[PDB]
Amino acid sequence: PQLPDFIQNKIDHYIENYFDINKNGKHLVLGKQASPDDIILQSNDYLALANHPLIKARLAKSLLEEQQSLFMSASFLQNDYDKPMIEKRLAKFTGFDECLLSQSGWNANVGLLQTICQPNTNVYIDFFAHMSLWEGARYANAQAHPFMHNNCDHLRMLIQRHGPGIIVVDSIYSTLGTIAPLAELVNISKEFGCALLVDESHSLGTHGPNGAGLLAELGLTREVHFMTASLAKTFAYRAGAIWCNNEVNRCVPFISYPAIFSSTLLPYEAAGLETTLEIIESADNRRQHLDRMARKLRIGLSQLGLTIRSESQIIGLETGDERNTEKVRDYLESNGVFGSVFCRPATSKNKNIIRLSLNSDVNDEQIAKIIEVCSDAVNYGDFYFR
Amino acid sequence: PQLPDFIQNKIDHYIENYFDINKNGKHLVLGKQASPDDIILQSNDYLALANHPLIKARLAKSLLEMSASFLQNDYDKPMIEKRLAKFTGFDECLLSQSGWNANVGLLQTICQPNTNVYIDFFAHMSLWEGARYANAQAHPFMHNNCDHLRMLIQRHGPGIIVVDSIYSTLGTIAPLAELVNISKEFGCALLVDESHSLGTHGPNGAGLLAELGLTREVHFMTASLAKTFAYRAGAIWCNNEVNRCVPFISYPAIFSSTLLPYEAAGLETTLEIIESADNRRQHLDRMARKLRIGLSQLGLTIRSESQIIGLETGDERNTEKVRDYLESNGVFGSVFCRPATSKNKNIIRLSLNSDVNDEQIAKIIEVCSDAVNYGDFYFR
Numbered sequence: 001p002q003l004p005d006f007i008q009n010k011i012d013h014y015i016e017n018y019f020d021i022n023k024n025g026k027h028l029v030l031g032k033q034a035s036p037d038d039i040i041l042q043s044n045d046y047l048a049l050a051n052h053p054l055i056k057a058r059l060a061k062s063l064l065e066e067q068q069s070l071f072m073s074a075s076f077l078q079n080d081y082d083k084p085m086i087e088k089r090l091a092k093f094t095g096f097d098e099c100l101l102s103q104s105g106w107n108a109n110v111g112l113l114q115t116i117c118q119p120n121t122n123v124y125i126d127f128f129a130h131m132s133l134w135e136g137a138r139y140a141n142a143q144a145h146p147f148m149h150n151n152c153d154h155l156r157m158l159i160q161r162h163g164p165g166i167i168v169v170d171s172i173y174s175t176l177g178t179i180a181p182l183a184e185l186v187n188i189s190k191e192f193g194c195a196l197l198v199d200e201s202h203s204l205g206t207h208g209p210n211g212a213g214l215l216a217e218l219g220l221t222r223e224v225h226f227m228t229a230s231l232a233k234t235f236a237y238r239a240g241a242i243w244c245n246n247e248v249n250r251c252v253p254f255i256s257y258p259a260i261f262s263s264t265l266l267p268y269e270a271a272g273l274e275t276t277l278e279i280i281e282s283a284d285n286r287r288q289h290l291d292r293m294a295r296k297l298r299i300g301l302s303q304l305g306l307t308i309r310s311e312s313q314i315i316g317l318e319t320g321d322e323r324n325t326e327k328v329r330d331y332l333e334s335n336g337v338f339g340s341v342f343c344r345p346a347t348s349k350n351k352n353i354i355r356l357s358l359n360s361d362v363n364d365e366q367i368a369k370i371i372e373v374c375s376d377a378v379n380y381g382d383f384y385f386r
Numbered sequence: 387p388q389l390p391d392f393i394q395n396k397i398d399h400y401i402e403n404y405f406d407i408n409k410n411g412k413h414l415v416l417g418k419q420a421s422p423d424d425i426i427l428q429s430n431d432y433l434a435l436a437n438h439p440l441i442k443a444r445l446a447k448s449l450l451e452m453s454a455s456f457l458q459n460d461y462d463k464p465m466i467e468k469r470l471a472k473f474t475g476f477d478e479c480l481l482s483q484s485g486w487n488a489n490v491g492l493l494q495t496i497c498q499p500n501t502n503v504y505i506d507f508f509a510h511m512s513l514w515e516g517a518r519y520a521n522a523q524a525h526p527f528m529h530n531n532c533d534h535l536r537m538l539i540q541r542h543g544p545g546i547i548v549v550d551s552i553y554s555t556l557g558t559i560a561p562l563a564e565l566v567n568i569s570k571e572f573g574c575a576l577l578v579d580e581s582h583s584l585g586t587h588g589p590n591g592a593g594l595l596a597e598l599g600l601t602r603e604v605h606f607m608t609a610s611l612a613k614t615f616a617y618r619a620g621a622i623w624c625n626n627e628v629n630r631c632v633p634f635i636s637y638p639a640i641f642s643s644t645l646l647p648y649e650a651a652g653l654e655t656t657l658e659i660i661e662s663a664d665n666r667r668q669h670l671d672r673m674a675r676k677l678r679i680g681l682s683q684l685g686l687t688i689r690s691e692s693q694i695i696g697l698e699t700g701d702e703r704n705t706e707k708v709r710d711y712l713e714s715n716g717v718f719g720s721v722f723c724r725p726a727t728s729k730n731k732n733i734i735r736l737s738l739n740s741d742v743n744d745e746q747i748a749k750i751i752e753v754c755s756d757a758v759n760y761g762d763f764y765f766r
């Protein structure tokens with residue numbers, strides 16, 4: 001069947017503009033194939049749990065136990081006896097009143113926002129908040145008011161102008177790894193009668209007592225209305241969750257379109273999460289090691305004169321435009337360093353990033369090596385850094 | 387902290403209007419807990435594969451022992467995709483995290499801000515929302531009504547025609563052959579969501595398009611793999627190069643984590659079982675026809691031509707009464723209400739699967755017969 005010219009031309013153009021323009025003819029995010037000894041810094045499995053034998057054993061076990069044939073909407077599974085223990089456990093874990101399982105962090109954000117927003121609703125969103133939060137607001141037809149990254153002064157001015165709303169931030173930001181000024185955001189929330197929504201995808205498991213997160217680390221838990229997280233990072237699982245210090249999670253399952261109209265996690269998936277939680281709660285050792293290696297990389301790269309905004313295990317090399325980004329990517333890759341290209345639609349076209357994500361398995365030698373490769377890239381590379 | 391009024395007010399009213407008015411103070415979809423004796427007709431696992439010993443073994447085995455945008459190199463793309471393309475007769479297949487994401491991502495990839503999307507009034511919500519997120523121009527056409535569609539396309543110009551092969555709430559079948567003609571005639575692209583026909587229909591379960599010999603004139607086919615394939619994923623099929631681009635354009639494809647590599651191996655075994663389940667397809671088809679005839683003759687509107695049977699129960703108060711009657715008598719369907727239906731056209735859906743018995747079919751007809759005679763409520 002021949003595509004109509006209205007679609008054919010769009011694909012033809014995309015291919016020319018997004019694939020062809022690159023030396024290797026692939027999309028920018030696709031470099032060379034890595035090798036065993038290369039240093040890979042791409043996975044969000046921060047505490048290196050993907051292959052944990054206890055997690056695998058518990059998943060396989062409950063999977064082998066059989067089937068409830070629960071291939072249907074989670075809307076139908078909201079009777080207390082159908083709700084998975086993992087929700088009660090995750091709630092207790094973070095200190096929030098209630099938790100609701102979602103199919104992904106994306107759906108948790110889109111779902112929560114749909115539930116708490118009306119079309120008139122003011123949404124004060126950090127310019128660098130995750131796309132799912134921007135999109136969640138847009139799907140709900142809310143009135144979004146972006147504030148400059150981590151800028152509480154700018155935020156106050158916005159709220160003073162537009163009224164009570166929902167303040168939306170990442171606790172730790174996904175591209176550049178900065179940390180939100182959470183204590184002050186809470187004070188602003190309280191001052192102006194707003195609700196706070198904190199996405200802890202990148203701090204949950206890695207931060208706080210027993211890995212309960214940044215809000216728990218800072219003692220803010222009881223002062224925040226909402227928290228969300230992808231469970232695809234530290235929890236190493238394809239799912240998400242919404243936590244509420246109120247009754248909102250009673251309503252989300254029947255209001256959120258992704259919650260209603262897309263199939264539920266199967267019971268055996270929830271059970272595997274229970275073991276993951278247990279391992280995370282006990283992983284003080286890995287948390288400490290990760291923190292230290294991350295501080296080492298930050299400091300080391302900073303002394304190079306590189307712009308390093310990060311205060312976390314996420315480190316963003318700012319490589320400007322797509323041409324310059326290809327060059328840096330190639331140089332990094334040729335030498336044994338494999339980060340992730342972040343580019344448009346995630347960034348603006350002239351502010352691409354090569355993201356280095358650290359995990360608790362990275363060691364002191366690999367760190368030193370990464371500093372060295374970047375040192376050379378600076379000194380000698382035929383390209384620039386922002 | 388207490389919610390600000392602008393949230394608290396909304397939640398308060400919602401709970402009053404959606405939970406409080408029902409006899410059990412819960413949302414309308416929540417009824418009684420079933421007993422092992424009861425007939426359960428809620429799962430979309432049509433060929434009853436959720437607990438198949440071989441599927442569970444393949445997954446356990448494979449498991450024992452980031453964004454998919456980054457995984458689009460030849461060597462990173464899973465073999466299940468090539469097997470699914472072959473199974474279906476379409477040129478290429480791309481895995482997605484859900485049928486919802488499949489539809490949303492495809493539409494985001496092929497739509498522009500004013501693209502005409504000619505969508506069946508009853509097409510899945512994911513297709514409606516996918517068009518909406520893309521800021522496409524939606525032109526709903528009355529259910530299965532090709533006259534209305536011809537008028538809309540004549541009026542608004544070429545665009546994308548979007549239907550379910552089998553419709554999720556009432557089990558009707560799209561007039562696919564005629565829809566193909568229309569798209570050819572009007573220079574449109576056709577998108578068919580086969581979530582409810584894939585695995586249950588066609589040669590080896592290849593689906594409705596394959597059954598009808600239409601594969602080669604449809605541009606796109608999508609499906610939730612959470613129905614017959616009994617897995618939390620979806621897939622986009624293309625008779626063209628579109629899947630080359632989806633992975634870098636669709637927001638769900640870019641910004642939400644990928645299926646893990648062991649999940650694809652489970653799909654491979656599932657596909658093999660489905661290809662060979664002629665027995666179960668046959669039995670299911672027989673039971674579904676038996677049910678439609680039995681119910682129709684009671685005077686209920688039964689629009690279904692498939693394994694999905696929709697009891698039309700009108701407004702919410704009536705629907706609650708019907709639900710409670712059914713459940714009290716050992717028949718458990720799924721309530722479909724608003725935002726899925728209009729508030730006055732609720733449905734109690736019966737999803738048949740290949741494990742369902744002759745004796746069970748008779749019992750459902752019997753319960754519905756008595757319900758029709760009871761006097762406490764109506765059916766449309």
Ligand SMILES: CCCCCCCCCC(=O)C/N=C/c1c(COP(=O)(O)O)cnc(C)c1O
Binds near residue numbers: 073724
């Ligand atoms: C507040 C509850 C309102 C009534 C209950 C509605 C239940 C809706 C459940 C679904 O819509 C499941 N849909 C699956 C699906 C999908 C998405 O598949 P997945 O995202 O579940 O894989 C796509 N296309 C079609 C035709 C589909 O049927």
Ligand SMILES: CCCCCCCCCC(=O)C/N=C/c1c(COP(=O)(O)O)cnc(C)c1O
Binds near residue numbers: 106
């Ligand atoms: C055409 C390539 C564009 C550049 C590459 C973009 C890669 C983006 C990958 C992500 O955004 C993963 N995001 C996860 C995430 C999510 C969504 O969670 P999940 O749906 O993956 O469970 C929510 N919140 C935060 C802060 C998150 O970081």
Ligand SMILES: [Cl-]
Binds near residue numbers: 340452453
């Ligand atoms: Cl990623």
